[PDB]
Ligand binder design. Structure first.
Ligand code: MG
Ligand code: MG
Ligand code: MG
Ligand code: MG
Ligand code: MG
Ligand code: MG
Ligand code: MG
Ligand code: MG
Ligand code: MG
Ligand code: MG
Ligand code: MG
Ligand code: MG
Ligand code: MG
Ligand code: MG
Ligand code: MG
Ligand code: MG
Ligand code: MG
Ligand code: MG
Ligand code: MG
Ligand code: MG
Ligand code: MG
Ligand code: MG
Ligand code: MG
Ligand code: MG
Ligand code: MG
Ligand code: MG
Ligand code: MG
Ligand code: MG
Lengths: 175, 49, 122, 72
RNA sequence: UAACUAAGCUGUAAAAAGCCCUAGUUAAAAUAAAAUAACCCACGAAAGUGACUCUAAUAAUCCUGACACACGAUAGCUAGGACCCAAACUGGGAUUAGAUACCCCACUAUGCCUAGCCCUAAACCCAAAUAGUUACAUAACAAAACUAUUCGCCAGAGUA
RNA sequence: UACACAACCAUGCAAGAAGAGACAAGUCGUAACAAGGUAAGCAUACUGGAAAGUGUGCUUGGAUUACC
RNA sequence: CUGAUG
């Protein structure tokens, strides 16, 4: 997890000269300690786009939009961890995840190398949409488990039978 | 310009040393924010009385 | 100024008000905030009789504390000020100066809306 | 106008509700009798699987819980 | 809940019933709700939201698109808590030939908070979404008539 | 050779339960169509021989007669 | 204030 220091000297007051010559009373007010959550969001977005992307000026890229939405997704998850019954933020998060997955699909279809690097850097495990979207009910789950166990038992008994037959052939070919 | 302006405001801040001074300064220099308006659009302050 | 503390202190003597403001600013400085200024709005009559700390308050001294504070201590300062018997009603708001005065364009002449009904002959 | 059909549907729904209130417990008996046969048919369809697959008995560690007879 | 005063208070077109531990004034917690501003039309996907303050925050470099996922007013259920006030039900008092109703009084579930369900509306703006036009052109009324890509529906009525 | 072997369905009957419909005429009330004499209807809960009544939200498929 | 039916 990322941990921005309280004295990060946020981007709005970072590129200008004469920032380390002022006193601590001014630096502490111009830092992230007296800042809001949007300032931390901007700091995380900048620090992630500077290390994951290759051209931070090309914001219109799918690889940049994926990072900009990943920051918001992680912030919404941090919000959900404190607020449980918040339905609007939960819907926002569940739709932002779907938008990020759609853009991941587009990036995988356009440039495979950038997609594979984005996934490895952001930890997003791109899952392929499973066809035949169905609600797994109790009957279907029980029948599938039964069929799986029956298949395993049948193949196990057939393997044991083949082993016994191989042993009986080896004992009969010798004498 | 914002940084230079904030630098000037840091000169009059209240600290552990200036606490006892600012308390007795504010308790003897009261302030007022009451100001009315007119139909023409001009403001008046009761400090003129 | 970022935040603003409207403090309503009980009508007491000059050294008592001085010590009350001293301890309040000391608590605000311990909670991680630097006080910019302090303005006494004078001891005026309360618009209504406030009942706080099992006391019927009829008058009260108004104080205005503009400062910078992180978003994590606003509730702690309010909890500290609530349990103070010399504080009648504390309020922690945003300072009205951080909202830049946008351009009041003026009374834009809005015409009467048309095309609300068909052209059928009555 | 349309209130004719509205009141017609209202009266039909009201009569259905009154019939349900009058024959409530008979409907519950029929529901239990249908769920029983449902569970029995499910049990037989499960038992047919391994019998057509070659297994003589049920696989080890199989309980076949009740999915329709779940109490409220 | 305490203190002064009076034998009356509430109650309808008229009464009765109920309360006379009642009624007015002065003070007074806990709970529920949030006058005027609002001739405002904003926010949110919809339901929904307008007593104050603070923190978080309101997706998509933005097409349509399910039976999948996630929400979904009041009303209903379970457990714990709260209960001023209103009231399903119920008990009384009127009226009626009858009134298990509209009228009056008392009272309960419930409306209130947390957690978990139920997933329903005239969920109507009865007008689907996306980008546009004023060309031809009034079944009637109503909110005037329409384009191109779509999604989901519509085969007489009752039965339902 | 070693096992389940009428379970599962379909076709008729069934003591019976309930509903819907048509079928000149009845009994008991008047629910809605007019501010149908209590304005209606939707979801839901309760109650009543019955149409229905009531409570909580919702729409006008109703007006509030328009210098009133 | 109330007044059912054809
Ligand atoms: Mg019918
Ligand atoms: Mg009496
Ligand atoms: Mg109480
Ligand atoms: Mg209010
Ligand atoms: Mg909107
Ligand atoms: Mg947006
Ligand atoms: Mg879409
Ligand atoms: Mg109660
Ligand atoms: Mg009451
Ligand atoms: Mg009664
Ligand atoms: Mg409820
Ligand atoms: Mg619901
Ligand atoms: Mg609605
Ligand atoms: Mg419709
Ligand atoms: Mg004509
Ligand atoms: Mg659509
Ligand atoms: Mg049909
Ligand atoms: Mg009338
Ligand atoms: Mg009638
Ligand atoms: Mg009526
Ligand atoms: Mg009626
Ligand atoms: Mg009547
Ligand atoms: Mg009517
Ligand atoms: Mg009604
Ligand atoms: Mg109903
Ligand atoms: Mg009743
Ligand atoms: Mg009643
Ligand atoms: Mg009408």
């Amino acid at each position: 997890q990322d941990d921005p220091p309280p004295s990060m000297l946020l981007l709005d007051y970072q590129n200008v000269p004469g920032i380390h010559k002022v006193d601590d009373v001014v630096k502490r007010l111009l830092s992230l300690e007296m800042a809001n959550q949007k300032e931390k969001l901007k700091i995380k977005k900048m620090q992630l786009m500077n290390k994951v992307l290759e051209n931070p000026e090309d914001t219109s890229s799918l690889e940049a939009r994926i990072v900009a939405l990943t920051v918001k997704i992680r912030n919404y998850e941090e919000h959900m961890q404190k607020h449980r019954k918040d339905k609007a933020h939960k819907r926002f998060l569940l739709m932002s995840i779907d938008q990020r997955k759609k853009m991941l699909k587009n990036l995988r279809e356009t440039n495979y190398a950038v997609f594979e690097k984005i996934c490895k850097e952001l930890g997003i495990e791109y899952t392929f949409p499973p066809p035949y979207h169905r609600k797994a009910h109790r009957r279907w789950v029980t029948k599938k488990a039964l069929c799986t166990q029956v298949f395993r038992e049948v193949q196990k008994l057939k393997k044991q039978k083949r082993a016994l037959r191989a042993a009986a052939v080896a004992a009969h070919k010798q004498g | 310009q914002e940084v230079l302006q904030l630098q000037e405001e840091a000169k009059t801040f209240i600290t552990r040393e200036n606490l006892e001074a600012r308390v007795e300064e504010a308790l003897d220099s009261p302030k007022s924010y009451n100001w009315a308006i007119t139909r023409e659009g001009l403001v008046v302050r009761p400090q003129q009385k | 100024p970022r935040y603003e503390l409207a403090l309503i202190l009980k009508a007491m003597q000059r050294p008592e008000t001085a010590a009350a403001l001293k301890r309040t600013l000391e608590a605000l400085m311990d909670r991680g905030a630097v006080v910019r200024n302090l303005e006494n709005l004078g001891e005026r009559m309360l618009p209504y009789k406030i009942s706080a700390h099992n006391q019927r308050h009829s008058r009260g001294g108004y104080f205005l504390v503009d400062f910078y504070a992180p978003a994590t201590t606003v509730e702690s300062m309010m909890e500290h000020l609530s349990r103070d018997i010399d504080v009648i009603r504390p309020n922690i708001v945003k300072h009205p100066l951080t909202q830049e005065v946008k351009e009041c364009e003026g009374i834009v002449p809005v015409p009467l809306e048309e095309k609300l009904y068909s052209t059928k002959k009555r | 106008k349309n209130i004719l059909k509205i009141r017609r549907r209202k009266m039909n729904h009201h009569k259905y509700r009154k019939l349900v209130k009058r024959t409530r417990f008979l409907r519950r008996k029929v529901r239990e009798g249908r769920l029983r046969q449902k569970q029995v048919k499910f049990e037989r369809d499960l038992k047919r699987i391994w019998q057509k697959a070659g297994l003589k008995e049920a696989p080890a560690g199989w309980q076949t819980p009740k999915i329709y007879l779940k109490n409220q």
